[PDB]
Amino acid sequence: PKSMQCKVILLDGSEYTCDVEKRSRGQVLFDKVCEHLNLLEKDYFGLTYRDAENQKNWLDPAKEIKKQVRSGAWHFSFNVKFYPPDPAQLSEDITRYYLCLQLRDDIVSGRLPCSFVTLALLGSYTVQSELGDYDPDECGSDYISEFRFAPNHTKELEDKVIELHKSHRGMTPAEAEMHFLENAKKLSMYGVDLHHAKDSEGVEIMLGVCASGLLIYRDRLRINRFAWPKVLKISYKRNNFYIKIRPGEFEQFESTIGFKLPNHRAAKRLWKVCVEHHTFFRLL
Ligand SMILES: CN1CCN(C(=O)Nc2ccccc2)CC1
Numbered sequence: 001p002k003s004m005q006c007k008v009i010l011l012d013g014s015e016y017t018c019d020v021e022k023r024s025r026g027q028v029l030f031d032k033v034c035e036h037l038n039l040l041e042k043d044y045f046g047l048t049y050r051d052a053e054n055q056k057n058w059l060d061p062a063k064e065i066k067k068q069v070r071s072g073a074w075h076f077s078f079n080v081k082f083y084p085p086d087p088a089q090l091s092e093d094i095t096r097y098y099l100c101l102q103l104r105d106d107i108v109s110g111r112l113p114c115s116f117v118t119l120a121l122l123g124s125y126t127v128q129s130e131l132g133d134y135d136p137d138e139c140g141s142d143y144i145s146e147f148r149f150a151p152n153h154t155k156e157l158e159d160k161v162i163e164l165h166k167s168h169r170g171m172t173p174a175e176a177e178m179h180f181l182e183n184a185k186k187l188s189m190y191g192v193d194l195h196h197a198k199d200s201e202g203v204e205i206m207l208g209v210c211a212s213g214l215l216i217y218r219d220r221l222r223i224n225r226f227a228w229p230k231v232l233k234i235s236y237k238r239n240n241f242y243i244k245i246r247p248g249e250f251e252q253f254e255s256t257i258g259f260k261l262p263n264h265r266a267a268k269r270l271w272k273v274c275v276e277h278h279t280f281f282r283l284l
Helices: 026-037 093-108 115-133 155-166 171-182 264-282
Strands: 005-011 016-021 043-048 055-059 075-080 193-199 205-209 213-217 222-228 231-237 239-247 256-262
Touching: 005 026, 016 026, 016 043, 026 043, 026 075, 026 264, 055 264, 075 093, 093 115, 115 155, 115 171, 115 213, 193 264, 231 264
Parallel strands: 005 075
Antiparallel strands: 005 016, 043 055, 043 075, 193 205, 193 256, 205 213, 213 222, 231 239, 239 256
């Protein structure tokens, strides 16, 4: 029985290596990574791989790994797939911990924009969780944390983390992680998967996929929002993505909104993430 070596980047930046039978479905590898991580609330998470175009794709747990990675390396990342709107409702602290790790990477990477003060506040909870109570012995007037808090670090930001860290004395890791999530969950781009697209007129937009629905970022004035219940049908064809917007009260007909994606693979990827978000966040 021939086995393929899999390498998984974990959310703490370390690497997990295992083997699976070469005809394995994604679920087999995902089950091994989750066991390694001691993670039971697995439904929020998944594995990503880079396709031949270097795009991030979700590994489909129901399909053979080899039919997804195709000609590429069996190299994956462990990621949050479905960002819970209310992390306080997750049953385990360790779930909230991985969610924190993911969001810290979302912030550092610039995928999750954040004000100065929220960067410092989120940083201060991470430091409280990881080092415990503020200690002046470690931090002089010139202190710079090993911790990555933001796309761009300034001394002002490091100083503000320390000032907020002072206020969290006696806070337990689970308690600091819950506070981290209470603040992070409110950010306008929390759990928004962004896709480059063009509207029916060829104007460049972004499409956001999240728990609530589909967001159209047309310009800074007017953001269109389609709550999942208002969406009956999601389709793709060639380079196009279509949504069928439920008829309003006393309207005779469904309406159709069409978007152009860079290529057919980009259209299919957006279609699958929408269908997956719609199925997941319906059961709420
Ligand atoms: C101030 N808002 C609060 C709600 N939330 C959304 O945008 N939700 C949404 C609603 C309908 C369709 C798509 C998304 C985050 C920021």
